[PDB]
Amino acid sequence: MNSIFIKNLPTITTRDDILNFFSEVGPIKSIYLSNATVKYLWAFVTYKNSSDSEKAIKRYNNFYFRGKKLLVTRAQDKEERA
Numbered sequence: 001m002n003s004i005f006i007k008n009l010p011t012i013t014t015r016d017d018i019l020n021f022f023s024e025v026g027p028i029k030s031i032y033l034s035n036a037t038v039k040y041l042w043a044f045v046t047y048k049n050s051s052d053s054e055k056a057i058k059r060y061n062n063f064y065f066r067g068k069k070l071l072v073t074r075a076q077d078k079e080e081r082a
Contacts, residue, residue, distance in 0.1 A: 002050045003075035006043040010066040026052025
């Protein structure tokens, strides 16, 4: 409920890029940036404040970063039922 996925990232994306863009909505607790070696990277960002993760989706989904339209979605944990 604090975490988002960021996909369609440019391959030259750095941890600092994620930090600089996504800290604008609120304090970031943790970041994973894939060491994908292919066409696009992905990131997993956890916010300290739950409200900020929703803000990040609202503000950065479909945001262009180096010509790439970012996909920013909620990282929802596994549901209980099949």
